[PDB]
Design a protein around this ligand. Structure first.
Ligand SMILES: *[C@@H]1O[C@H](CO)[C@@H](O)[C@H](O)[C@H]1NC(C)=O
Lengths: 97, 391, 49, 49
Protein backbone atom coordinates (compact mmCIF):
# COMPACT_ATOMS: atom_id res chain seq x y z
CA UNK A 1 0.00 0.00 0.00
CA UNK A 2 2.49 2.61 1.19
CA UNK A 3 5.08 1.50 -1.40
CA UNK A 4 3.30 3.60 -4.02
CA UNK A 5 3.61 6.54 -1.61
CA UNK A 6 6.85 5.31 0.03
CA UNK A 7 8.92 7.24 -2.51
CA UNK A 8 7.23 10.64 -2.98
CA UNK A 9 6.86 12.33 0.40
CA UNK A 10 9.80 10.62 2.14
CA UNK A 11 12.35 9.51 -0.50
CA UNK A 12 12.27 11.87 -3.51
CA UNK A 13 11.23 14.73 -1.23
CA UNK A 14 14.72 14.55 0.34
CA UNK A 15 16.83 14.91 -2.85
CA UNK A 16 17.57 11.24 -3.51
CA UNK A 17 20.05 10.02 -6.13
CA UNK A 18 19.82 6.23 -5.79
CA UNK A 19 17.34 3.94 -4.05
CA UNK A 20 18.30 0.63 -2.43
CA UNK A 21 15.65 -2.10 -2.37
CA UNK A 22 14.83 -4.11 0.75
CA UNK A 23 14.61 -7.87 1.28
CA UNK A 24 11.15 -9.42 1.70
CA UNK A 25 10.82 -11.28 5.01
CA UNK A 26 9.39 -14.23 3.08
CA UNK A 27 12.06 -15.37 0.58
CA UNK A 28 9.47 -16.74 -1.88
CA UNK A 29 8.02 -13.31 -2.71
CA UNK A 30 8.94 -10.29 -4.82
CA UNK A 31 6.72 -7.42 -3.66
CA UNK A 32 9.80 -5.51 -2.49
CA UNK A 33 11.42 -4.47 -5.82
CA UNK A 34 8.23 -3.87 -7.84
CA UNK A 35 7.29 -0.35 -6.57
CA UNK A 36 10.78 1.13 -6.24
CA UNK A 37 11.52 0.24 -9.86
CA UNK A 38 8.16 1.69 -10.98
CA UNK A 39 7.81 5.05 -9.22
CA UNK A 40 11.52 5.81 -9.62
CA UNK A 41 11.78 3.75 -12.81
CA UNK A 42 9.86 6.30 -14.89
CA UNK A 43 11.44 9.16 -12.91
CA UNK A 44 14.87 8.13 -14.26
CA UNK A 45 16.06 7.52 -10.70
CA UNK A 46 18.36 4.46 -10.63
CA UNK A 47 17.35 1.73 -8.18
CA UNK A 48 19.87 -0.82 -6.90
CA UNK A 49 18.63 -4.33 -6.19
CA UNK A 50 20.46 -6.14 -3.40
CA UNK A 51 18.00 -9.02 -2.79
CA UNK A 52 16.15 -9.30 -6.12
CA UNK A 53 16.59 -12.93 -7.18
CA UNK A 54 13.83 -12.89 -9.81
CA UNK A 55 14.75 -12.57 -13.48
CA UNK A 56 12.00 -10.11 -14.44
CA UNK A 57 14.24 -7.15 -13.54
CA UNK A 58 16.62 -8.05 -16.35
CA UNK A 59 15.13 -6.54 -19.54
CA UNK A 60 14.97 -2.79 -18.69
CA UNK A 61 12.20 -2.34 -21.26
CA UNK A 62 10.16 -2.44 -18.06
CA UNK A 63 11.92 -1.52 -14.82
CA UNK A 64 14.16 0.81 -16.80
CA UNK A 65 16.05 2.23 -13.80
CA UNK A 66 17.12 -0.92 -11.98
CA UNK A 67 20.54 -2.25 -10.97
CA UNK A 68 21.09 -5.59 -9.24
CA UNK A 69 23.90 -6.61 -6.90
CA UNK A 70 22.97 -10.31 -7.22
CA UNK A 71 22.53 -12.31 -10.44
CA UNK A 72 18.99 -13.63 -10.90
CA UNK A 73 17.84 -17.25 -10.96
CA UNK A 74 18.07 -17.40 -14.76
CA UNK A 75 21.84 -16.94 -14.54
CA UNK A 76 22.06 -20.43 -13.04
CA UNK A 77 21.86 -21.62 -16.66
CA UNK A 78 25.19 -19.91 -17.38
CA UNK A 79 27.04 -22.13 -14.90
CA UNK A 80 25.00 -25.22 -15.80
CA UNK A 81 26.47 -25.26 -19.32
CA UNK A 82 29.95 -24.99 -17.84
CA UNK A 83 29.00 -27.57 -15.21
CA UNK A 84 28.19 -30.21 -17.82
CA UNK A 85 31.10 -28.92 -19.91
CA UNK A 86 33.39 -30.65 -17.38
CA UNK A 87 31.28 -33.83 -17.09
CA UNK A 88 30.84 -34.18 -20.89
CA UNK A 89 27.04 -34.32 -20.58
CA UNK A 90 25.19 -33.67 -23.84
CA UNK A 91 21.71 -35.25 -23.51
CA UNK A 92 19.73 -32.97 -21.19
CA UNK A 93 16.01 -32.28 -20.84
CA UNK A 94 14.84 -28.99 -19.34
CA UNK A 95 11.98 -28.97 -16.81
CA UNK A 96 10.92 -25.36 -16.22
CA UNK A 97 7.74 -23.50 -15.37
CA UNK B 1 -20.09 -0.72 -12.70
CA UNK B 2 -18.68 2.80 -12.45
CA UNK B 3 -16.17 3.77 -15.14
CA UNK B 4 -13.78 6.64 -14.38
CA UNK B 5 -12.53 8.29 -17.57
CA UNK B 6 -9.15 9.76 -16.57
CA UNK B 7 -7.46 12.08 -19.06
CA UNK B 8 -4.45 14.32 -18.44
CA UNK B 9 -2.48 16.87 -20.43
CA UNK B 10 -3.59 19.52 -22.91
CA UNK B 11 -6.65 18.00 -24.60
CA UNK B 12 -10.42 18.53 -24.84
CA UNK B 13 -12.25 17.15 -21.81
CA UNK B 14 -15.63 18.47 -22.97
CA UNK B 15 -15.39 16.35 -26.13
CA UNK B 16 -14.70 13.34 -23.90
CA UNK B 17 -17.46 14.45 -21.52
CA UNK B 18 -20.10 14.89 -24.23
CA UNK B 19 -19.24 11.65 -26.04
CA UNK B 20 -19.17 9.54 -22.87
CA UNK B 21 -22.60 10.72 -21.71
CA UNK B 22 -24.16 9.58 -25.02
CA UNK B 23 -24.58 5.91 -24.16
CA UNK B 24 -25.62 4.13 -27.36
CA UNK B 25 -27.12 1.10 -25.59
CA UNK B 26 -28.96 1.43 -22.27
CA UNK B 27 -29.51 -2.33 -21.85
CA UNK B 28 -26.51 -2.47 -19.48
CA UNK B 29 -25.75 -0.38 -16.40
CA UNK B 30 -22.87 1.64 -17.82
CA UNK B 31 -23.16 4.27 -15.02
CA UNK B 32 -20.03 6.10 -16.26
CA UNK B 33 -18.66 8.20 -13.40
CA UNK B 34 -16.64 10.46 -15.67
CA UNK B 35 -14.53 12.43 -13.18
CA UNK B 36 -12.28 13.64 -16.03
CA UNK B 37 -9.66 14.92 -13.60
CA UNK B 38 -7.56 17.27 -15.73
CA UNK B 39 -4.78 17.48 -13.13
CA UNK B 40 -1.45 16.35 -14.56
CA UNK B 41 -1.02 12.72 -13.45
CA UNK B 42 2.64 12.63 -14.50
CA UNK B 43 3.73 12.30 -10.87
CA UNK B 44 2.92 8.91 -9.29
CA UNK B 45 1.43 10.51 -6.18
CA UNK B 46 -1.31 12.24 -8.18
CA UNK B 47 -2.45 9.15 -10.10
CA UNK B 48 -2.16 6.65 -7.23
CA UNK B 49 -4.09 8.93 -4.86
CA UNK B 50 -6.96 9.76 -7.22
CA UNK B 51 -7.59 6.11 -8.16
CA UNK B 52 -8.46 4.87 -4.68
CA UNK B 53 -10.54 7.91 -3.76
CA UNK B 54 -12.40 7.53 -7.05
CA UNK B 55 -13.20 3.99 -5.92
CA UNK B 56 -13.95 5.33 -2.44
CA UNK B 57 -16.26 8.17 -3.50
CA UNK B 58 -18.31 6.46 -6.21
CA UNK B 59 -17.71 2.73 -5.51
CA UNK B 60 -16.57 2.28 -9.11
CA UNK B 61 -15.31 -1.03 -10.50
CA UNK B 62 -13.57 0.16 -13.66
CA UNK B 63 -11.18 2.83 -14.94
CA UNK B 64 -10.06 3.98 -18.39
CA UNK B 65 -6.87 6.03 -18.60
CA UNK B 66 -5.92 8.67 -21.17
CA UNK B 67 -2.75 10.71 -21.53
CA UNK B 68 -1.20 13.27 -23.88
CA UNK B 69 2.53 13.27 -23.08
CA UNK B 70 5.06 10.58 -23.94
CA UNK B 71 5.12 8.94 -20.48
CA UNK B 72 7.16 5.96 -21.61
CA UNK B 73 6.46 4.07 -18.36
CA UNK B 74 3.24 5.58 -16.99
CA UNK B 75 1.71 2.25 -18.00
CA UNK B 76 4.38 0.50 -15.92
CA UNK B 77 3.14 2.23 -12.77
CA UNK B 78 -0.46 1.85 -13.98
CA UNK B 79 0.02 -1.91 -14.20
CA UNK B 80 1.05 -1.94 -10.52
CA UNK B 81 -2.39 -0.64 -9.50
CA UNK B 82 -4.01 -3.28 -11.70
CA UNK B 83 -1.87 -6.04 -10.18
CA UNK B 84 -2.28 -4.98 -6.54
CA UNK B 85 -6.02 -4.39 -6.96
CA UNK B 86 -8.47 -6.32 -9.15
CA UNK B 87 -10.34 -3.53 -10.95
CA UNK B 88 -9.69 -3.71 -14.72
CA UNK B 89 -7.96 -0.71 -16.28
CA UNK B 90 -7.93 -0.14 -20.05
CA UNK B 91 -5.54 2.25 -21.73
CA UNK B 92 -6.78 4.75 -24.29
CA UNK B 93 -4.10 7.08 -25.63
CA UNK B 94 -0.74 8.57 -24.76
CA UNK B 95 1.48 7.09 -22.07
CA UNK B 96 -0.59 3.90 -22.00
CA UNK B 97 -0.45 3.37 -25.78
CA UNK B 98 2.88 1.55 -25.95
CA UNK B 99 2.59 -2.18 -25.28
CA UNK B 100 4.26 -3.46 -22.13
CA UNK B 101 6.38 -6.54 -22.78
CA UNK B 102 5.34 -8.65 -19.77
CA UNK B 103 2.99 -7.90 -16.88
CA UNK B 104 1.85 -9.63 -13.70
CA UNK B 105 -0.06 -12.90 -13.93
CA UNK B 106 -3.00 -11.10 -12.27
CA UNK B 107 -2.49 -7.83 -14.17
CA UNK B 108 -5.81 -6.19 -15.04
CA UNK B 109 -4.32 -4.27 -17.97
CA UNK B 110 -5.44 -4.02 -21.60
CA UNK B 111 -3.77 -1.43 -23.82
CA UNK B 112 -4.72 0.07 -27.17
CA UNK B 113 -2.08 -0.55 -29.82
CA UNK B 114 -0.42 -3.33 -31.79
CA UNK B 115 2.37 -5.35 -30.23
CA UNK B 116 5.84 -5.82 -31.69
CA UNK B 117 4.78 -9.14 -33.25
CA UNK B 118 1.93 -7.41 -35.09
CA UNK B 119 4.31 -4.67 -36.21
CA UNK B 120 6.65 -7.37 -37.54
CA UNK B 121 3.92 -9.07 -39.58
CA UNK B 122 2.57 -5.92 -41.23
CA UNK B 123 5.97 -4.89 -42.61
CA UNK B 124 6.31 -8.30 -44.24
CA UNK B 125 2.86 -7.80 -45.77
CA UNK B 126 4.15 -4.57 -47.31
CA UNK B 127 7.15 -6.53 -48.57
CA UNK B 128 4.94 -9.29 -49.99
CA UNK B 129 2.84 -6.82 -51.98
CA UNK B 130 5.84 -5.11 -53.61
CA UNK B 131 7.91 -8.30 -54.03
CA UNK B 132 11.02 -7.17 -52.14
CA UNK B 133 11.77 -10.75 -51.16
CA UNK B 134 15.46 -10.05 -50.50
CA UNK B 135 15.91 -8.36 -47.12
CA UNK B 136 18.27 -7.97 -44.18
CA UNK B 137 17.74 -7.32 -40.47
CA UNK B 138 19.60 -4.89 -38.23
CA UNK B 139 18.76 -4.78 -34.52
CA UNK B 140 20.12 -3.81 -31.11
CA UNK B 141 20.15 -5.08 -27.53
CA UNK B 142 16.76 -3.47 -26.88
CA UNK B 143 14.25 -6.02 -25.52
CA UNK B 144 11.81 -7.40 -28.05
CA UNK B 145 14.57 -8.04 -30.58
CA UNK B 146 14.52 -11.68 -29.49
CA UNK B 147 10.80 -11.60 -30.39
CA UNK B 148 10.96 -9.23 -33.38
CA UNK B 149 13.54 -11.41 -35.13
CA UNK B 150 11.76 -14.60 -34.06
CA UNK B 151 8.47 -13.45 -35.60
CA UNK B 152 10.31 -12.58 -38.82
CA UNK B 153 12.30 -15.82 -38.71
CA UNK B 154 9.22 -17.98 -38.10
CA UNK B 155 7.31 -16.37 -40.98
CA UNK B 156 10.29 -16.69 -43.32
CA UNK B 157 11.04 -20.30 -42.38
CA UNK B 158 9.26 -22.91 -44.53
CA UNK B 159 7.40 -20.52 -46.83
CA UNK B 160 6.24 -20.81 -50.43
CA UNK B 161 7.66 -17.37 -51.22
CA UNK B 162 11.38 -17.50 -51.93
CA UNK B 163 12.49 -15.23 -49.10
CA UNK B 164 16.17 -14.26 -48.88
CA UNK B 165 17.35 -13.44 -45.34
CA UNK B 166 20.98 -12.76 -44.46
CA UNK B 167 23.26 -10.43 -42.50
CA UNK B 168 21.50 -10.22 -39.14
CA UNK B 169 23.30 -7.49 -37.19
CA UNK B 170 22.96 -7.30 -33.39
CA UNK B 171 25.16 -4.33 -32.45
CA UNK B 172 24.35 -0.75 -31.48
CA UNK B 173 25.74 2.33 -29.71
CA UNK B 174 25.55 0.88 -26.19
CA UNK B 175 29.11 -0.44 -26.38
CA UNK B 176 31.78 2.18 -25.76
CA UNK B 177 33.82 3.26 -28.81
CA UNK B 178 31.42 1.37 -31.07
CA UNK B 179 31.99 3.65 -34.07
CA UNK B 180 34.61 1.27 -35.49
CA UNK B 181 32.66 -1.79 -34.28
CA UNK B 182 29.60 -1.05 -36.45
CA UNK B 183 31.20 0.19 -39.69
CA UNK B 184 32.87 -3.13 -40.50
CA UNK B 185 29.59 -5.05 -40.26
CA UNK B 186 27.53 -2.34 -41.97
CA UNK B 187 29.75 -2.81 -45.04
CA UNK B 188 28.47 -6.41 -45.22
CA UNK B 189 24.90 -5.33 -45.99
CA UNK B 190 23.95 -5.78 -49.65
CA UNK B 191 20.17 -6.26 -49.70
CA UNK B 192 18.03 -3.38 -51.02
CA UNK B 193 15.67 -3.81 -48.03
CA UNK B 194 16.90 -3.49 -44.44
CA UNK B 195 14.69 -4.16 -41.41
CA UNK B 196 15.68 -2.01 -38.44
CA UNK B 197 14.79 -2.29 -34.75
CA UNK B 198 16.30 0.35 -32.46
CA UNK B 199 15.46 3.39 -30.34
CA UNK B 200 14.50 6.71 -31.94
CA UNK B 201 17.55 8.41 -30.43
CA UNK B 202 19.97 5.80 -31.77
CA UNK B 203 17.98 5.47 -35.01
CA UNK B 204 19.39 8.83 -36.11
CA UNK B 205 22.86 7.77 -34.95
CA UNK B 206 22.70 4.35 -36.63
CA UNK B 207 21.83 6.01 -39.95
CA UNK B 208 24.73 8.46 -39.59
CA UNK B 209 27.11 5.49 -39.76
CA UNK B 210 25.04 4.11 -42.64
CA UNK B 211 25.22 7.46 -44.44
CA UNK B 212 29.00 7.51 -44.00
CA UNK B 213 29.28 4.01 -45.49
CA UNK B 214 26.80 4.97 -48.21
CA UNK B 215 23.79 2.74 -47.44
CA UNK B 216 21.30 5.52 -48.12
CA UNK B 217 19.74 7.45 -50.97
CA UNK B 218 17.94 5.66 -53.78
CA UNK B 219 18.13 1.91 -54.21
CA UNK B 220 17.80 1.24 -50.46
CA UNK B 221 14.47 1.06 -48.64
CA UNK B 222 14.40 0.68 -44.85
CA UNK B 223 11.48 -0.19 -42.58
CA UNK B 224 11.22 0.68 -38.88
CA UNK B 225 8.66 -0.09 -36.13
CA UNK B 226 6.36 2.34 -34.34
CA UNK B 227 8.64 3.15 -31.40
CA UNK B 228 11.39 4.21 -33.82
CA UNK B 229 9.01 6.77 -35.34
CA UNK B 230 8.21 8.09 -31.86
CA UNK B 231 6.23 11.12 -33.00
CA UNK B 232 5.03 12.17 -36.44
CA UNK B 233 5.46 15.86 -35.62
CA UNK B 234 8.99 15.27 -34.28
CA UNK B 235 11.07 14.62 -37.41
CA UNK B 236 14.77 14.49 -36.38
CA UNK B 237 15.75 15.53 -39.96
CA UNK B 238 18.22 12.62 -39.96
CA UNK B 239 16.01 9.80 -41.25
CA UNK B 240 16.40 9.38 -45.03
CA UNK B 241 13.55 9.96 -47.44
CA UNK B 242 11.79 6.65 -47.98
CA UNK B 243 11.75 5.45 -44.36
CA UNK B 244 8.47 3.52 -44.30
CA UNK B 245 7.18 2.81 -40.80
CA UNK B 246 4.03 1.36 -39.26
CA UNK B 247 2.38 2.84 -36.17
CA UNK B 248 -0.98 3.06 -34.46
CA UNK B 249 -3.38 5.52 -36.07
CA UNK B 250 -3.11 8.82 -34.19
CA UNK B 251 -5.40 10.74 -36.58
CA UNK B 252 -8.53 8.74 -37.41
CA UNK B 253 -8.94 7.00 -34.03
CA UNK B 254 -9.67 10.17 -32.10
CA UNK B 255 -9.87 10.55 -28.33
CA UNK B 256 -13.70 10.91 -28.19
CA UNK B 257 -13.85 7.88 -30.47
CA UNK B 258 -11.46 5.90 -28.25
CA UNK B 259 -13.52 6.35 -25.08
CA UNK B 260 -16.73 5.54 -26.98
CA UNK B 261 -15.55 2.04 -27.89
CA UNK B 262 -13.24 1.73 -24.87
CA UNK B 263 -15.99 2.40 -22.33
CA UNK B 264 -18.15 -0.12 -24.20
CA UNK B 265 -15.65 -2.99 -23.82
CA UNK B 266 -15.58 -3.00 -20.02
CA UNK B 267 -19.34 -2.56 -19.65
CA UNK B 268 -20.40 -5.44 -21.90
CA UNK B 269 -17.75 -7.78 -20.47
CA UNK B 270 -18.57 -7.03 -16.82
CA UNK B 271 -22.32 -7.33 -17.43
CA UNK B 272 -21.73 -10.76 -18.97
CA UNK B 273 -20.52 -11.96 -15.56
CA UNK B 274 -23.68 -10.69 -13.85
CA UNK B 275 -25.67 -13.01 -16.12
CA UNK B 276 -23.79 -16.05 -14.77
CA UNK B 277 -22.80 -14.62 -11.37
CA UNK B 278 -25.83 -12.57 -10.21
CA UNK B 279 -23.41 -10.76 -7.87
CA UNK B 280 -21.37 -7.74 -8.95
CA UNK B 281 -17.77 -7.97 -7.66
CA UNK B 282 -17.09 -5.23 -5.10
CA UNK B 283 -13.41 -4.64 -4.30
CA UNK B 284 -12.82 -2.57 -1.18
CA UNK B 285 -13.30 1.14 -1.87
CA UNK B 286 -9.72 1.95 -0.92
CA UNK B 287 -6.11 1.45 -2.00
CA UNK B 288 -5.28 -0.29 1.30
CA UNK B 289 -6.31 -3.59 2.92
CA UNK B 290 -5.33 -5.55 -0.20
CA UNK B 291 -4.81 -8.70 1.88
CA UNK B 292 -8.51 -8.85 2.80
CA UNK B 293 -9.91 -7.16 -0.34
CA UNK B 294 -8.48 -9.78 -2.73
CA UNK B 295 -10.56 -12.71 -1.44
CA UNK B 296 -13.42 -11.92 -3.85
CA UNK B 297 -11.27 -12.38 -6.93
CA UNK B 298 -13.00 -11.83 -10.28
CA UNK B 299 -10.41 -13.36 -12.61
CA UNK B 300 -13.27 -15.06 -14.46
CA UNK B 301 -14.12 -11.60 -15.81
CA UNK B 302 -10.59 -11.36 -17.24
CA UNK B 303 -10.87 -14.78 -18.89
CA UNK B 304 -13.70 -13.45 -21.08
CA UNK B 305 -12.87 -9.73 -20.97
CA UNK B 306 -10.55 -10.34 -23.93
CA UNK B 307 -13.27 -11.89 -26.12
CA UNK B 308 -15.57 -8.92 -26.70
CA UNK B 309 -17.14 -7.73 -29.97
CA UNK B 310 -18.86 -4.35 -30.28
CA UNK B 311 -20.71 -2.91 -33.30
CA UNK B 312 -19.46 -5.71 -35.55
CA UNK B 313 -15.76 -4.90 -35.22
CA UNK B 314 -14.04 -7.22 -32.75
CA UNK B 315 -11.97 -5.26 -30.22
CA UNK B 316 -10.54 -8.41 -28.64
CA UNK B 317 -7.29 -8.20 -26.69
CA UNK B 318 -4.62 -10.88 -26.68
CA UNK B 319 -3.97 -12.96 -23.57
CA UNK B 320 -0.70 -11.07 -23.07
CA UNK B 321 -2.77 -7.87 -23.19
CA UNK B 322 -2.45 -6.31 -26.64
CA UNK B 323 -5.12 -5.63 -29.24
CA UNK B 324 -5.63 -8.61 -31.54
CA UNK B 325 -6.86 -6.63 -34.57
CA UNK B 326 -5.67 -3.01 -34.37
CA UNK B 327 -6.12 -0.31 -37.00
CA UNK B 328 -2.50 0.16 -38.01
CA UNK B 329 -1.47 2.86 -40.49
CA UNK B 330 1.60 2.81 -42.73
CA UNK B 331 3.62 6.03 -42.62
CA UNK B 332 6.37 7.07 -45.03
CA UNK B 333 8.96 9.86 -44.91
CA UNK B 334 8.72 11.99 -48.05
CA UNK B 335 11.36 14.41 -49.34
CA UNK B 336 9.99 17.28 -47.20
CA UNK B 337 11.00 15.69 -43.86
CA UNK B 338 7.34 15.12 -42.95
CA UNK B 339 5.69 11.80 -42.18
CA UNK B 340 3.19 10.92 -44.92
CA UNK B 341 0.35 8.43 -44.55
CA UNK B 342 0.25 5.65 -47.14
CA UNK B 343 -2.20 2.87 -46.31
CA UNK B 344 -4.29 1.16 -43.67
CA UNK B 345 -3.80 -2.36 -42.32
CA UNK B 346 -6.60 -4.40 -40.73
CA UNK B 347 -8.19 -7.86 -40.87
CA UNK B 348 -4.90 -9.31 -42.19
CA UNK B 349 -5.48 -7.16 -45.30
CA UNK B 350 -2.95 -4.57 -46.48
CA UNK B 351 -4.69 -1.93 -48.61
CA UNK B 352 -2.69 1.12 -49.67
CA UNK B 353 -3.12 3.95 -52.16
CA UNK B 354 0.24 3.54 -53.93
CA UNK B 355 -0.22 0.45 -56.10
CA UNK B 356 3.38 0.98 -57.26
CA UNK B 357 6.33 2.38 -55.34
CA UNK B 358 7.00 6.11 -55.93
CA UNK B 359 10.75 5.49 -56.26
CA UNK B 360 12.32 7.30 -59.21
CA UNK B 361 17.06 7.69 -63.36
CA UNK B 362 17.29 4.14 -62.01
CA UNK B 363 13.51 3.61 -62.31
CA UNK B 364 12.48 3.36 -65.96
CA UNK B 365 9.04 2.24 -67.08
CA UNK B 366 8.68 -0.40 -69.79
CA UNK B 367 5.62 -0.95 -72.00
CA UNK B 368 5.03 -4.46 -73.30
CA UNK B 369 2.28 -6.40 -75.07
CA UNK B 370 1.01 -9.88 -74.18
CA UNK B 371 1.81 -11.82 -77.34
CA UNK B 372 3.70 -14.97 -78.32
CA UNK B 373 6.48 -16.72 -76.37
CA UNK B 374 8.04 -13.25 -76.52
CA UNK B 375 5.78 -12.17 -73.64
CA UNK B 376 3.35 -14.43 -71.76
CA UNK B 377 0.90 -13.48 -68.99
CA UNK B 378 -1.35 -16.13 -67.44
CA UNK B 379 -2.55 -15.05 -63.96
CA UNK B 380 -1.49 -13.89 -60.50
CA UNK B 381 -1.14 -16.12 -57.45
CA UNK B 382 -3.64 -15.10 -54.73
CA UNK B 383 -2.81 -17.86 -52.23
CA UNK B 384 0.07 -15.86 -50.73
CA UNK B 385 -0.32 -12.49 -52.47
CA UNK B 386 2.95 -12.81 -54.40
CA UNK B 387 2.96 -12.95 -58.19
CA UNK B 388 5.11 -16.04 -58.90
CA UNK B 389 8.66 -17.33 -59.08
CA UNK B 390 10.92 -16.81 -62.11
CA UNK B 391 8.54 -14.15 -63.46
CA UNK C 1 20.77 -34.02 -5.97
CA UNK C 2 23.62 -32.14 -7.64
CA UNK C 3 22.17 -28.86 -6.45
CA UNK C 4 23.49 -25.34 -6.72
CA UNK C 5 23.69 -22.32 -4.40
CA UNK C 6 25.61 -19.06 -4.05
CA UNK C 7 28.12 -17.69 -1.56
CA UNK C 8 28.47 -14.14 -0.19
CA UNK C 9 25.16 -13.34 -1.92
CA UNK C 10 22.91 -13.50 1.14
CA UNK C 11 25.18 -11.21 3.21
CA UNK C 12 22.78 -8.31 2.79
CA UNK C 13 24.33 -6.50 5.77
CA UNK C 14 27.71 -6.65 4.01
CA UNK C 15 26.13 -6.16 0.56
CA UNK C 16 25.41 -2.46 1.06
CA UNK C 17 29.12 -1.68 1.54
CA UNK C 18 29.76 -2.90 -1.99
CA UNK C 19 26.42 -1.39 -3.02
CA UNK C 20 27.38 2.04 -1.69
CA UNK C 21 30.97 1.61 -2.88
CA UNK C 22 30.08 1.58 -6.57
CA UNK C 23 27.57 4.45 -6.45
CA UNK C 24 29.71 6.68 -4.21
CA UNK C 25 32.66 6.18 -6.54
CA UNK C 26 30.27 6.77 -9.46
CA UNK C 27 29.09 10.21 -8.35
CA UNK C 28 32.74 11.32 -8.53
CA UNK C 29 32.61 11.00 -12.31
CA UNK C 30 28.96 12.08 -12.37
CA UNK C 31 29.84 15.51 -10.96
CA UNK C 32 32.84 15.92 -13.25
CA UNK C 33 31.31 17.01 -16.58
CA UNK C 34 29.16 19.81 -17.99
CA UNK C 35 25.39 20.35 -17.47
CA UNK C 36 25.13 18.08 -14.43
CA UNK C 37 21.46 18.31 -13.48
CA UNK C 38 19.72 18.03 -10.09
CA UNK C 39 17.57 15.15 -8.85
CA UNK C 40 13.81 15.79 -8.95
CA UNK C 41 12.40 17.80 -6.05
CA UNK C 42 9.34 16.36 -4.36
CA UNK C 43 6.75 14.25 -6.15
CA UNK C 44 3.80 16.43 -7.20
CA UNK C 45 5.97 19.45 -8.02
CA UNK C 46 8.18 17.52 -10.42
CA UNK C 47 6.46 16.29 -13.56
CA UNK C 48 9.08 14.84 -15.93
CA UNK C 49 12.36 12.98 -16.23
CA UNK D 1 13.94 -56.24 -46.28
CA UNK D 2 16.65 -58.85 -46.85
CA UNK D 3 19.20 -56.04 -46.68
CA UNK D 4 17.55 -54.98 -43.43
CA UNK D 5 18.09 -58.43 -41.91
CA UNK D 6 21.84 -58.32 -42.55
CA UNK D 7 21.97 -54.71 -41.34
CA UNK D 8 20.30 -55.51 -38.01
CA UNK D 9 22.41 -58.56 -37.14
CA UNK D 10 25.71 -56.70 -37.62
CA UNK D 11 24.49 -53.72 -35.55
CA UNK D 12 22.76 -55.16 -32.43
CA UNK D 13 19.44 -53.34 -32.57
CA UNK D 14 15.81 -54.46 -32.69
CA UNK D 15 13.51 -53.24 -35.45
CA UNK D 16 9.74 -53.03 -35.91
CA UNK D 17 8.53 -52.44 -39.47
CA UNK D 18 5.60 -50.05 -39.87
CA UNK D 19 4.47 -48.71 -43.23
CA UNK D 20 3.50 -45.17 -44.20
CA UNK D 21 -0.09 -43.99 -43.88
CA UNK D 22 -0.54 -41.75 -46.93
CA UNK D 23 1.81 -43.90 -49.02
CA UNK D 24 3.84 -41.21 -50.80
CA UNK D 25 7.63 -41.30 -50.89
CA UNK D 26 8.07 -37.79 -49.54
CA UNK D 27 8.07 -34.17 -50.68
CA UNK D 28 7.50 -30.61 -49.50
CA UNK D 29 4.06 -29.27 -50.39
CA UNK D 30 1.94 -26.26 -49.50
CA UNK D 31 -0.99 -26.57 -47.10
CA UNK D 32 -4.29 -24.74 -47.43
CA UNK D 33 -4.72 -21.56 -45.36
CA UNK D 34 -1.27 -20.00 -45.90
CA UNK D 35 1.89 -21.58 -47.28
CA UNK D 36 3.55 -23.22 -44.24
CA UNK D 37 5.08 -26.01 -46.31
CA UNK D 38 5.40 -29.38 -44.58
CA UNK D 39 6.80 -32.80 -45.38
CA UNK D 40 4.40 -35.64 -46.17
CA UNK D 41 4.88 -39.38 -46.51
CA UNK D 42 8.02 -40.96 -45.09
CA UNK D 43 9.69 -37.60 -44.54
CA UNK D 44 6.86 -36.32 -42.37
CA UNK D 45 6.89 -39.64 -40.52
CA UNK D 46 10.64 -39.31 -39.90
CA UNK D 47 10.94 -35.68 -38.78
CA UNK D 48 7.86 -35.99 -36.55
CA UNK D 49 9.31 -38.94 -34.63
C1 LIG E 1 25.06 -57.99 -29.21
O1 LIG E 1 24.36 -57.77 -28.01
C2 LIG E 1 24.13 -58.98 -27.28
C3 LIG E 1 23.41 -58.59 -26.01
O2 LIG E 1 22.98 -57.24 -26.05
C4 LIG E 1 25.46 -59.69 -27.03
O3 LIG E 1 25.47 -60.92 -27.75
C5 LIG E 1 26.64 -58.83 -27.45
O4 LIG E 1 26.75 -57.70 -26.59
C6 LIG E 1 26.51 -58.35 -28.90
N1 LIG E 1 27.01 -59.36 -29.82
C7 LIG E 1 27.84 -59.09 -30.83
C8 LIG E 1 28.26 -57.66 -30.97
O5 LIG E 1 28.25 -59.97 -31.59
Amino acid sequence: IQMALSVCEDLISSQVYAILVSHPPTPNDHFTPTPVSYTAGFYRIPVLGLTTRMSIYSDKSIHLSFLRTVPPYSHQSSVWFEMMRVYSWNHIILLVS
Amino acid sequence: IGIAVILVGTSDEVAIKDAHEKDDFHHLSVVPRVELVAMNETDPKSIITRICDLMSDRKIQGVVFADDTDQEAIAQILDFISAQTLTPILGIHGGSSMIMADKDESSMFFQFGPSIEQQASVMLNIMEEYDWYIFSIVTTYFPGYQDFVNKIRSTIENSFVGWELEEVLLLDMSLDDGDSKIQNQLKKLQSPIILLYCTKEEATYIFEVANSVGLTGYGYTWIVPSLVAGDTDTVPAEFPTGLISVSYDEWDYGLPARVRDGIAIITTAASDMLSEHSFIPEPKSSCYNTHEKRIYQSNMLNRYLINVTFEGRNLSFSEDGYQMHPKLVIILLNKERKWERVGKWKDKSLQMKYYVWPRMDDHLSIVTLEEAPFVIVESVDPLSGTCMRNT
Amino acid sequence: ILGLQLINGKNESAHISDAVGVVAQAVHELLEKENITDPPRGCVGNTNI
Amino acid sequence: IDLLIKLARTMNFTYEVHLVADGKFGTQERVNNSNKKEWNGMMGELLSG
